[model samples]
Each structure stands twice: as C-alpha cells, then as structure tokens.
Target chain A: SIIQVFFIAGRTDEQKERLIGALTDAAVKTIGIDRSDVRVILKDIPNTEYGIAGKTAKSLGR
Target chain B: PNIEMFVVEGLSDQQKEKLIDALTAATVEAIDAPADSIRVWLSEIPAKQFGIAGKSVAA
Candidate 1:
C-alpha cells in the first residue's frame, strides 16, 4: 500500500468526501492498483499559517 | 502506515463520521489493504490561513 498526502485550504465536507472517493478511484483505475492499497491524507493549512509571495495569507486578506 | 487529511474546518459530526468511513472504503478498494489495518486522519485548517499563487484562497 502507498500513502498519499494532499495540502489544501478550506473545502466543504461533501467536497472532501467526493475528492477522497475520486482520488481512490483514480488510483485504482490509473495505477491498476486495488483501492484498498491506497491511503490518502489531507493536511489543511490555515491562511494564518500559510505564506505566499512573502506575505501571510491572512495578511494578504486571502 | 497511516493516512492523514488536512482540510478546512466546517464538517458536522455526521459528516466527519461519513467522511471517515468513505475514505476507509476508498482506500480498501484501491489498495487491497486490510480494512482493519488502514488508518485515516483528518486535520482541519482555517480558510483565512490558506494561500494559493501568492494569494489566500479566502481572498
């Protein structure tokens, strides 16, 4: 089995659920692997904690 | 060894439960891993804090 990680901002629960399921299906179809062999992890970064162009997301009014 | 998911905060308790179950099922179906051996973790981030292309998604 392989572990996969995703870094994303805010998303609705329904979206997350769909995303998760879609990714799993993608892996199975594209990689020719069993769905059970894939593991997905999502790490959400807060605008306060994230930075871009040397500016914090919060400071940039993200 | 484990799956960790980071996402924005806003899920209801029911949603969380369903998310976990769906994720687990997906994993099991994709990887052939034992259902009992798979682990999924959800980490929530505030929307105001996430950035994209030098801009915050919240913007």
Candidate 2:
C-alpha cells in the first residue's frame, strides 16, 4: 500500500479528479497494486505561503 | 500518524478547514489510522520550484 500526497497550486475539481485517476492508473500499471490500495491526497497551499528564490508566489504575481 | 503535503499555494480558508476534516476521514478509512493520531500539514511551494518532466509548474 502506498499513500500519495500532492502539494500543488489551486486547481479545479475536474483537474484534481483527472490527476487522481492518472496517478492511480500509473500505480496499478507499474506496481501492480489494486485500485483500492492506492490513496491520493491533494494539498493546496496559499500564495502567501509559497516562495522560491527569495520571492513569494504573491510577489511573483502567481 | 504524520502526513505532510506540499503544493503550490492557493486554497481558500473554507477549503482549508474542510480539507483537514476530509483528509483525516480519508486517512482513517484507508489505513484505519486513528483520526486523532493522524496529522496533516500543508506546505506551499512556489510554482517555479515545482517541476515535472523537467518543466516547472510556472512554465
């Protein structure tokens, strides 16, 4: 059993659903795990909290 | 009991509140972990730093 957690910018529910399906498919295809055994968790962060190279996402106009 | 996820930033206050509960429930259901024992922390990574297939999310 593998628990997969993703941290990404805000995304639509449709995008998230597709991502879940794609990840699950890859797990099953590559690792031969049952669909039910795959767990996907999505974590959406805020612009104020995201940063890179001494700049926050908000500063970068993300 | 510790679950951490880093995503590019962009979640509403309401979504954050609901997600904590929703994720806790899902964890409990999937792994049979105790809700109280499961801890989920959300960290925000900039799109410029997050990459897939050598392409940054910002791109």
Candidate 3:
C-alpha cells in the first residue's frame, strides 16, 4: 500500500544494496507494517538532473 | 501529466530495477493514467535528515 521512489546520482551497486535495506527498515518502522507490504524504488540521475537553489548539481560540484 | 515522485534512501538492484515498472503499472490501474505519461523520480535522504515522530531512524 506504499510506494517509494528515490532519485539520486547513480551509485555503486553495493551502495544501492545497503540503501534499500536501510530505507525499507525505516519505512516499516515508521509505518508499522511488514516489509513485504512496502515498495521501494531507486532512480539514478546524473548531475544534470539535479538542481539546487538557482544552479544545477553539476555546477555545484555534485 | 507527470508524476514527480519522491522516496526515501537505499534499495537493492532488483528492487530498484522493478520500481519503474511496478509504479507505472500501479498508476495505470489506480487512476487510468497512461503508462507513458507516468514518471517517477528517486532520491536518497539520510536517516539523520529524515525524521519520524521527531526522531531520525536511528532513534
């Protein structure tokens, strides 16, 4: 009943692996639900896809 | 006609791999939205930065 989609600069596979578990754990604890019932998604974006304030993430040395 | 979606950090490859498809399909069923019209964005937020009940995940 829950859908979570995350966007970040593409990362190593290992980083992603750890990320998923941590995020799911957080959500499950917060929502009081079983892990199976929760959905987590990760979207890897380039610096071009990220922006902060008035500049792109790339310009900011992301 | 865009779904700017946001979610919390950390997910496995298999989980992330299936997310787009799963969400697109869910959208079609839930609201009759066109599959191509749906878009989801994923992001990572630190546990310390994200809080529930006034405490981070660590707490």
Candidate 4:
C-alpha cells in the first residue's frame, strides 16, 4: 500500500516517468495494489550533497 | 449520549446509490468541501487475507 517515489535532482523526466510506470505496474500486478486503494507520497530533495541523519556524500568521503 | 441509529436495508441498486448520494452530500456540506475533492478507495479481498479470530471469510 506504500508507493514511495524517490529520485535525485539530475534524473530526467523520461527516467521519472519510466520509474513510475514500472513501479505502478509492479504494485498493481504483484501486490494487488489497486488504483483506488493507492496513496502516492512524493518525496523530494533539493540536491545530492545532503541527506538525512547528517550523512551526505561529502561526509562519507565519496 | 451515544444513541445508535440504524439505517434501513437498501434492497436495490438504485436505493443503494441514493443512500450513498445522500451521505456524500451530507459529508460535503458538513465539511464545506466540493464533492469532487472527495476520493474513493476500494479493494477486493480474498478469503485468505481477511479473518476474524480463527475463522477466515471462507470458513
């Protein structure tokens, strides 16, 4: 019942659309997640240099 | 006081539709929101997923 869409800022629109399509198809086909029974939560971040819990790419020496 | 109010059983599809319509109207007006904003969620559950105590829907 959880449709979580995660992406970075540099991802293309086509890539986002493809991801959504694939995830929706899998949710409906495998988990029996119907459109009527679905809740879509869109989570967005500003950039890739930052993340939760003070853990970032720079902090991890990446 | 928490008084219980029982609705009469709706026998036909028309009656059921009317009942739903009335409830929708009341809910919309009560919250002062447009009817279009209200969404519906429906699901078809098999006997295996839903159960009360030790007995499933089939049992």
TM per prediction: 0.49, 0.49, 0.48, 0.37
- Of the pair 3 and 4, which is ahead by TM-score? 3
Q: Give the alpha-carbon lDDT of every model.
A: 0.60, 0.65, 0.63, 0.46
lDDT of candidate 2 over A1-62, digit per residue (tens) = 44344454777655666666676777778888777666555556677787779888888877
Question: Candidate 1's residue-wise lDDT over B1-59, tens digit each?
Answer: 24665555656677667666766676556444466866677666676875545776577
The best-first sequence of candidates by lDDT reads: 2, 3, 1, 4
Please report the candidate that would top lDDT against the real structure.
2
lDDT by residue (tens digit), candidate 1, A1-62: 23354333665666556656766765455434577745655566777776769987788775
Give one digit per residue, the lDDT tens place, for model 3 in B1-59: 45554545577777876786887788899899887788876555545333343234444
Q: Which ten residues in a row have the lowest lDDT in candidate 2 chain A?
A: A1-10
Binned by DockQ into CAPRI classes (incorrect, acceptable, medium, high), candidate 3 is incorrect
- Per-residue lDDT of B34 in model 3: 84
Q: Compare candidates 1 and 4 on lDDT and give the better one.
A: 1
lDDT of 2 at A53: 90
Model 2 spans > 4 angstroms off:
B1-59
Return model 1's CA RMSD, one decimal: 15.6
**Error in Å for residue A4 of model 1:** 3.7
Candidate 4 error regions (>4 Å): A36-40, A52-55, A58-62, B1-59
Question: How well does chain A score by TM in each candidate?
Answer: 0.77, 0.81, 0.77, 0.57
The candidates' interface RMSDs, in order, read: 10.8, 10.7, 10.3, 15.2
